[PDB]
Design a protein around this ligand. Structure first.
Ligand SMILES: NC(=O)c1ccc[n+]([C@@H]2O[C@H](COP(=O)([O-])OP(=O)(O)OC[C@H]3O[C@@H](n4cnc5c(N)ncnc54)[C@H](OP(=O)(O)O)[C@@H]3O)[C@@H](O)[C@H]2O)c1
Length: 305
């Protein structure tokens, strides 16, 4: 299907998605305005989460673009995510039901485990295979068309894929992925298991002071990204998004700015050569922008491997 990839459960995922997270200081009504502008610009995959405290505004934007005739529900791929205080398996279905009620949708296209780092329902120690069984029952019930995971490393994905009794493989692993942390080996593994890698912080993250070192290089000021932008008469952001599409990664892009939202859909309008991709692959430097004690101290931190 046009500009989508086929998931391993048969559903289709659009290869460019709109990132909806804004920090707390942005008024909640902004997510309504920008999600409507993202749909108007041509985004058809919208990524939210319980954590983002925006599902009611994001859902209203979707319902509004349905009401005015721009799109039908089946034209939109909506993702939400189970937050880490709800890993205990009896909490999974009520958490998804809460997300649906907030968005006023009958189903999500995709429901993810947001992170493998379980928190007190203060860390919690939960066997995530039990969480996954509860995710499977939500796909059986029709609450989520597809289920997947987010922030898992290879060993953590294998624990699910190897589970006795497994009914549904995860359709995706949504992970931090960009030219300073391109996750090649994990991508190869995901490809080998028919699992889609979805990239977040593909434009270098929002640099949130709670978890990103401001000393970290700014991805879009990279001189190779900037040179390739000059060569293609595009921008460093479009070079960073198009790099993902050509390696078979589905890519998210957040923007709350009307011009940049419209700019990002231009990722479909041009392509990069083998030499351009090799120049971009040479930027890999094990730089995860999310780099905090509040993750690294956790018994199931994914960058331990
Ligand atoms: N699963 C998880 O744990 C997880 C973690 C992080 C993110 N995510 C998801 O991934 C989404 C994207 O990741 P992210 O929030 O880290 O942000 P990102 O997509 O890496 O974007 C980073 C910054 O790039 C700027 N930008 C966007 N388009 C641009 C363009 N064409 N030119 C120049 N700058 C541009 C935006 O600022 P403006 O708004 O000012 O344009 C944005 O704040 C999030 O919204 C969320 O949906 C998930």
């Amino acid at each position: 299907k046009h500009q989508c990839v086929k998931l391993n459960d048969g559903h289709f995922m659009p290869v460019l998605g709109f990132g909806t997270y804004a920090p707390p200081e942005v008024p909640r009504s902004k997510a309504l305005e920008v999600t409507k502008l993202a749909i108007e610009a041509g985004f058809r995959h919208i990524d939210s989460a319980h954590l983002y405290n925006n599902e009611e505004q994001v859902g209203l934007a979707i319902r509004s673009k349905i009401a005015d005739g721009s799109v039908k529900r089946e034209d939109i791929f909506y993702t939400s995510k189970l937050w880490s205080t709800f890993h205990r398996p009896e909490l999974v279905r009520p958490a998804l039901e809460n997300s649906l009620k907030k968005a006023q949708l009958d189903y999500v296209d995709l429901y993810l485990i947001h992170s493998p780092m379980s928190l007190k329902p203060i860390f919690d120690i939960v066997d995530l295979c039990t969480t996954w069984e509860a995710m499977e029952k939500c796909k059986d019930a029709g609450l989520a068309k597809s289920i997947g995971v987010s922030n898992f490393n290879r060993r953590q994905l294998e624990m699910i894929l190897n589970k006795p009794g497994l009914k549904y493989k995860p359709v995706c692993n949504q992970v931090e992925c960009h030219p300073y942390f391109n996750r090649s080996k994990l991508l190869d593994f995901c490809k080998s298991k028919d699992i889609v890698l979805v990239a977040y912080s593909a434009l270098g993250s929002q640099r949130d002071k709670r978890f990103v070192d401001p000393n970290s290089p700014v991805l879009l000021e990279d001189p190779v990204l900037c040179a390739l932008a000059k060569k293609h008469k595009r921008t460093p952001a479009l070079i960073a998004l198009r790099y993902q599409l050509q390696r078979g990664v589905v890519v998210l892009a957040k923007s709350y700015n009307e011009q940049r939202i419209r700019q990002n859909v231009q990722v479909f309008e041009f392509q990069l050569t083998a030499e351009d991709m090799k120049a971009i692959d040479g930027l890999d430097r094990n730089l995860h922008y999310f780099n905090s004690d509040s993750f690294a101290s956790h018994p199931n931190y994914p960058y331990s491997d």
